[PDB]
């Protein structure tokens, strides 16, 4: 082998192989010929110096120009490319698979990396597959996530983690399930709130709620459809509220695999819940299965008061209306029940800040 403009005998690996014309050129003549064309000729003069051989050429030539030229010479190449050819900055793409950067000025939505020779969508940067043809990137991204075996193996744990906990004070989002503990502590803002209804957990004598009888205790106030109360329901009764409104729920899966955060010396460690997964609980523990049912209940704005008996309606009346109810003359228990239910649903809405 030898350089095609000066004849210098040199091995193939020690010269620059022009990807277009395949002329072998020494580093010195390559570097000298292309910098003089930038500083004294025009952009069209940057053909090979040996053979005299538009946008794909510059896209490939930019690679070899970057390694051989000087920084100020490489900048003049982008300047003349912008001011003489493109009227704008060149579209520079970064390969997500091999971290190589390259100019891509073609019409196709699939770019082939000049380094790792792998093809990717120029807008979502994921590796190109035939399923992406004629499909939005979100449809394609959803197709891969819903065909990833290890994502499906997680089961409903992903649904509980996707529905995250947003701090009502500092809006910091946590991609965590609630579990059985409702008293949440935000590390960023120190605000204490209920993860089910986002109401404040008040310190001693901080609660402003009227007729509160636990003012001197750490506590919060919850709407009747908050997980704080609905966690005490049986899974059967929670499913009954769902069935009465034609809301489907899983009982079979599609140690509990729900990810929790254990505080360790090195910060926070992702630990699995690992509690018992009873039959009919979709592979989750008891607390996370009830959390899954209550999330479906909350998402559809189902009212648990529709299943209240008389004693439950009296408790709700004293709790949310601050009045001990009294049966009226001529009322039977059904009429007493309907009156209490009507007044409760009219005056006391469901959780106004519950994530639905």
């Amino acid at each position: 082998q030898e350089c095609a403009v000066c004849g210098w005998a040199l091995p193939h690996n020690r010269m620059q192989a022009l990807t277009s014309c395949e002329c072998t050129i020494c580093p010195d003549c390559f570097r000298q010929h292309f910098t003089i064309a930038l500083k004294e000729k025009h952009i069209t003069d940057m053909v090979c110096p040996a053979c005299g051989r538009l946008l794909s050429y510059f896209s490939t030539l930019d690679i070899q120009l970057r390694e051989s030229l000087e920084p100020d010479a490489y900048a003049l190449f982008h300047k003349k490319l912008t001011e003489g050819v493109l009227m704008r900055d060149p579209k520079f793409l970064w390969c997500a698979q091999c971290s190589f950067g390259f100019i891509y000025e073609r019409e196709q939505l699939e770019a082939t990396c000049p380094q790792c020779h792998q093809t990717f969508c120029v807008r979502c940067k994921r590796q190109w597959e035939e399923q992406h043809r004629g499909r939005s990137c979100e449809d394609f991204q959803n197709w891969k996530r819903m065909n990833d075996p290890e994502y499906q193996a997680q089961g409903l744990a992903m649904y509980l983690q996707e529905n995250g906990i947003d701090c009502p004070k500092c809006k910091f989002s946590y991609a965590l399930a609630r579990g059985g503990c409702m008293h949440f502590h935000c590390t960023q803002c120190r605000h204490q709130f209920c993860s089910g209804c986002y109401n404040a957990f008040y310190a001693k004598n901080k609660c402003p709620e009227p007729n509160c009888r636990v003012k001197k205790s750490l506590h919060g106030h919850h709407p009747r459809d908050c997980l704080f109360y609905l966690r005490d329901w049986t899974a059967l009764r929670l499913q009954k509220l769902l069935q009465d409104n034609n809301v489907m729920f899983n009982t079979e899966p599609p140690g509990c695999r729900v990810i929790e955060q254990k505080e360790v010396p090195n910060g926070l460690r992702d630990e699995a819940c690992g509690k018992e997964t009873p039959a009919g609980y979709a592979g989750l523990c008891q607390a996370h299965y009830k959390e899954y049912l209550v999330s479906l209940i909350n998402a559809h704005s189902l009212d648990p008061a529709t299943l209240y008996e008389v004693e439950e309606l009296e408790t709700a009346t004293e709790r949310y209306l601050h009045v001990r109810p009294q049966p009226l003359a001529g009322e039977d228990p059904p009429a007493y029940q309907a009156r209490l239910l009507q007044k409760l649903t009219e005056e006391v809405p469901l959780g106004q800040s519950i994530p639905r």
């Epitope: 970064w94 698979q97 940067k125 290890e150």
Partner: nanobody
Framework: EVQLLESGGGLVQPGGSLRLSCAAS????????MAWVRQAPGKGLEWVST????????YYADSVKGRFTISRDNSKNTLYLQMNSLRAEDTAVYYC?????????????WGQGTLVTVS
Amino acid sequence: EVQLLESGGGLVQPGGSLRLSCAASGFTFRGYSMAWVRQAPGKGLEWVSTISPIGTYTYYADSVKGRFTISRDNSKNTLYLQMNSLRAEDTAVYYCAKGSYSRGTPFDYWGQGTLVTVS
């Protein structure tokens, strides 16, 4: 949130060995390529190596290829860089980097860095 913690940097003699680790959390580790970069004193950031999501492919800078070996354990969400026959030029702060599918950058997260000094 995303977290990349490097460990394993220290003082080593020329010709010695050193194994760096990168503990990752806050993202599906197996779904992204991972990389190592470094910054020598007074110099610019230099790419070292990149490994594909499940480790099928590995890429190396010419100055480190063969001496360095990148690997990953997706079951533990950890990225490794085995550095063998360390030279004085390898003295740098070594950063763990997460591959990005966002337009405009090959990586969207870097770790805090670990300092390696070769006599």
